[PDB]
Amino acid sequence: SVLTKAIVNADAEARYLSPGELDRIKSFVASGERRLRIAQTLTEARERIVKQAGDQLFQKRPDVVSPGGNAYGEKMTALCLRDLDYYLRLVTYGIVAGDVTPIEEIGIIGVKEMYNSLQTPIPAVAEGVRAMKNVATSLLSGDDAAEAGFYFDYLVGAMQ
Amino acid sequence: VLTKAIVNADAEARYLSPGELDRIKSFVASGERRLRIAQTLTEARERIVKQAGDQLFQKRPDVVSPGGNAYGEKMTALCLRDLDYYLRLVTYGIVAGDVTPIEEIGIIGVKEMYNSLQTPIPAVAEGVRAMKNVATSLLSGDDAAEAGFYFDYLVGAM
Amino acid sequence: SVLTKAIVNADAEARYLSPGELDRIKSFVASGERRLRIAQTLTEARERIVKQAGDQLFQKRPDVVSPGGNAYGEKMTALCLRDLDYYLRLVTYGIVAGDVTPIEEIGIIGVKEMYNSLQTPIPAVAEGVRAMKNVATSLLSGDDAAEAGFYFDYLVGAM
Amino acid sequence: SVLTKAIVNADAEARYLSPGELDRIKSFVASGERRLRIAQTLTEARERIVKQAGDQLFQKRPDVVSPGGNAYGEKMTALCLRDLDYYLRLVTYGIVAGDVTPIEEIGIIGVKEMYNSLQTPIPAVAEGVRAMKNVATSLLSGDDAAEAGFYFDYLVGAMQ
Amino acid sequence: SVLTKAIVNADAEARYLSPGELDRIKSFVASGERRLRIAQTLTEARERIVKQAGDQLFQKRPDVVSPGGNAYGEKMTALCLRDLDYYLRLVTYGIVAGDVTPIEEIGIIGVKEMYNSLQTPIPAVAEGVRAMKNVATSLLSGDDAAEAGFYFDYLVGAM
Amino acid sequence: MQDAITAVINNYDVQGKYLDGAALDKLKAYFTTGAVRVRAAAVISSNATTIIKEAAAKALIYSDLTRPGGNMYTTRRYAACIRDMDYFLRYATYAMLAGDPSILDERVLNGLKETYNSLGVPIAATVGGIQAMKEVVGGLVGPDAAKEASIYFDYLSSGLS
Amino acid sequence: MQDAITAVINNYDVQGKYLDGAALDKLKAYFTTGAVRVRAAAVISSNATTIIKEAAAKALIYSDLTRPGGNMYTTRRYAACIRDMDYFLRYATYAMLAGDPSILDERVLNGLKETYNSLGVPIAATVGGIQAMKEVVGGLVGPDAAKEASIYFDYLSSGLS
Amino acid sequence: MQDAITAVINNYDVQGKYLDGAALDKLKAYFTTGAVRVRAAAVISSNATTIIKEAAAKALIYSDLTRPGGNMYTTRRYAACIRDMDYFLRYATYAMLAGDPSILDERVLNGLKETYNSLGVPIAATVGGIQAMKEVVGGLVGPDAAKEASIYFDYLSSGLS
């Protein structure tokens, strides 16, 4: 969260929170109520976002859902969609937190290693997240979408 | 299902058994649920066909190649039209509760028709399999199982 | 062979060989020496016929030797050529026999089923045989070619 | 090379070469003439090994040579074969050296990063190397093949 | 095999297997894993064993590879080496079986008659087998070599 | 033929005993397994052609058998061999639904060894093919179904050998 | 006759192939089973008389066969029937040690059906007796050994029928 | 660490005894086994990534552990678990070459239980994973090598539990 990040920087410096740091905290608390609504919207639309994004991903990457591909088969396709759902849940957590840290601990550290063992292609996963972003953006209002976009972009950046 | 029961009775030259009658009763109750499942696939029909087509072409580059039957716009359209036909038949099957409707329109003489066309039968089967996977994803699990049976039959027939 | 076919028909009828049937046998025995030469010619040119026909087939059907296609890959392409060689050997046997029966037993019964399990396209196989015919015809003299053509045509018809 | 490795260990310890280390050097110099022949054999058969391995790889992995796949197209397929050739050259160098170090510096360090930028699938590359091994093994005598196999296996292990 | 031999003796006597006979079977099954390794070693070294033995034999007997001699010429020399290979394969079979019977049926009965028709000298063949034994012994560990030696000796005795 | 339910009934009938709890338990066991079996059977029927193809690829083809002088050489013999493979698959599926091996004995297994010996068909190769089909089938059906499927395949194999 | 080890060897010999690891694995499998088999054989030999007694009690004696006009009526015929039972037991034991059914085919199975038909010995009753022996044997040998023992008994039964 | 050769030497050194024939025999025993071990080690190194993948598939994944609230839930934890699996494999390979279990005790086994308890990692699941790796390894190495490989895997498992 924003607050955790600020505290951590202060502790490293071994100082009380700077005025500038305090100001950022103030801004965050004001923003929070708006943020809560954005998160709520995505949660309600979660099921459809995942479904639509999946379809887009499969169109973008025929290979993944092909006999060679990892996603191929009902069991595997479900798992791929479950993964997309996981990332969406993480994004909602991020929006309320105001920072990527919650997202980062659960999803972005060791992600490469996990997927490499699974043999899932990392770029395809990124495409799925991009797809989810587009669906989510449409449901969100423009300003809301921009906020959500940042978190979505981070995920895409983290895993590529 | 009702036709099937009557036919068995007529062969035996007997009135329908209570057990047979009960199965008919169950079927008529199930029908409304079946209609909903069919409706879902109908709405998603256009996308199912499109997605399945792409999967098939990825699986079989050859079919959409200068040598291949599917190659060219006209031919590719016809291949997709065929996939659409089979999907329509599957929906009919689900509402009927039997493969017979599917079977009459699509599975008898299919080999002969495709051999004249020179279309490869295995590729057609793959396309149906592809359609099944797309359809399964949109359907709920129990609904998907019901739909799967009809899809499997088609694949078996072809 | 001609003779086998005639005998079999007679045995079914439970009769001695008909004069007409006997006449055809007489014609066949006279023809045989010419037939042997025709077969010999094709055997000598066998390696080249197969090679040329293969190339023609692959040009005619790019798809078969494509990643999707059955023929694709060295192992698979070799097998496709081996099949062409098999059919050529069968045709030579047919010419000497004067009948397709020898050909038919070894190659044409269950062929559809075998290839369907393999998933090999039957029409492509037919094209290969047609290609082999054209190569073979060129090396053969015209009358010889006509005789050879009949056997080649039968194969194409069978698949 | 064997010799380089031994010297480096000694220098770290700041000691003269140990008797055991010296013995290994002696063994290596005796082995060398046999090793030279093994390398020579593969060099002569190089062109065919690459060609055969390529075909095997493409059969095992249709996807790589498919419109989605990286290898697809003439230019791309040539590059994939060029890569296989590179790895074969490295293996020959290894056999004469008696150690993987020459191979390792040229080919195995940063390989993951390079291929990830290219987007080439690493497992497919490994399969290609495996394929090359099988072709090379057939041409080599059994004992020779075992020696060659070790170097081939290392490459496969490295690209994993 | 050891077990086959025991069963056969029992059946002739029309009795169940004797305790002593059963004990020998037990010993054999324990020995088998060691025997398998010995056989595996020889199989891997087979190509070199044959080659080395051949050379030794030809040095020992110049005559066999001479214009008069049977072995002379490439075709004939290949056949002589093929024979050596055959005998080595038989020896490996023997080691796993624990008995010479497998070896004996395939190679040692009628061998004299076969070679006499061929006109191959039997003593030279024996020398080749002896040569193979020496090569094989070197690769094998001492105890393993002794086991292998018995089978090799039997072959030499048989010819 | 006989099925599991009928087998229980028949055993009781020869005893003259009315159905008892122990008997009921056997029947109940079958009933639970039933649903799985039906699903497995449908899977096998749909994938039958492929199952045979894969199994042949694993054992029969690219072999001396297919090469000239081999049992499965010539189109006619090749077609016969794959027809036999299909028979085995279909009967095993029937047995799996039934829950009893008897049908295999009554139709497939009776006289097969003798037929094969007269024909000169190689039994060990056939057994190999059956085992290969089993492995392929196991994958498609999934684990719970696989155990049930395997016993019938093994029964066929034991009969032939 | 043939045994498992020799069977592997013979298959390789017709191919002309040197023994390979896959072949070695089959041989290795046999070697592990061997110890169990030897123990089972000793058990059977010691209890052979009783096994026959129990099996006869289960199926043959107290029946029409033993009653006048039955096949096993008269001392001479009774003695013959128990002699045949002993044969089956001894050969099955041999087969179990060998790990191969071939000896049963070569000695017991070949021409027995025809002999029995001429004699008017009832084959189904004999098969019943064999099955009974199997059950008794299974108990004595214990479970691991029983599975191995059962296959040879079943092989005899199938041959006769 | 210690290896078999050094273990013999050390035992003699504490006694102060010069090496004797009995000692030499133990050393000789090791030398024969050595060649097999080297081959096994190379196999394991090449297939290490796959071995881990297969073992995880058999036990760890598609389980409560991977599901939320499970120890291996989250990418970080998943990655940690597969890293640990790799460690076990590498050390077992080292032990197999060495012919001595001591290195496992010195590096892997020491303090692992305590570490795991503080972390809250489940020991039984870890042991399960090790056993799974053993099974996969056994296949690749082949039978002779498998016996040697198995003991080190079992040693790790016993230590953890």
Ligand SMILES: *[C@H](C)[C@H]1/C(=C/c2[nH]c(/C=C3N=C(/C=C4\NC(=O)C(CC)=C4C)C(C)=C\3CCC(=O)O)c(CCC(=O)O)c2C)NC(=O)[C@@H]1C
């Ligand atoms: C979909 C876009 C892609 C895809 C998905 C896919 N995933 C698996 C298996 C697993 N996925 C995960 C992922 C996570 N665990 C976590 O803790 C998080 C963050 C909260 C994630 C994202 C895990 C742990 C597994 C292992 C199985 C399990 O959950 O128990 C698969 C199948 C695995 C396999 O085949 O071995 C698939 C298909 N794969 C693709 O190719 C798509 C592009």
Ligand SMILES: *[C@H](C)[C@H]1/C(=C/c2[nH]c(/C=C3N=C(/C=C4\NC(=O)C(CC)=C4C)C(C)=C\3CCC(=O)O)c(CCC(=O)O)c2C)NC(=O)[C@@H]1C
């Ligand atoms: C070439 C024109 C086409 C082609 C051929 C092709 N064949 C195979 C495999 C087999 N072909 C045969 C066929 C025969 N066996 C016989 O006994 C006879 C008559 C004497 C024939 C003609 C067989 C038995 C096989 C099976 C494997 C084997 O040879 O043992 C393949 C490979 C099949 C595979 O997928 O593995 C191919 C490619 N394929 C084409 O598409 C060409 C048009």
Ligand SMILES: *[C@H](C)[C@H]1/C(=C/c2[nH]c(/C=C3N=C(/C=C4\NC(=O)C(CC)=C4C)C(C)=C\3CCC(=O)O)c(CCC(=O)O)c2C)NC(=O)[C@@H]1C
């Ligand atoms: C009575 C003096 C002694 C005695 C007898 C006894 N017998 C049995 C069982 C059987 N005895 C026979 C004998 C015959 N069957 C024949 O064909 C002939 C010749 C015509 C004879 C003499 C048979 C066949 C049986 C088997 C059972 C059957 O009828 O099917 C028993 C019981 C068997 C058992 O052990 O359960 C007995 C007790 N026993 C004595 O101790 C007396 C001294």
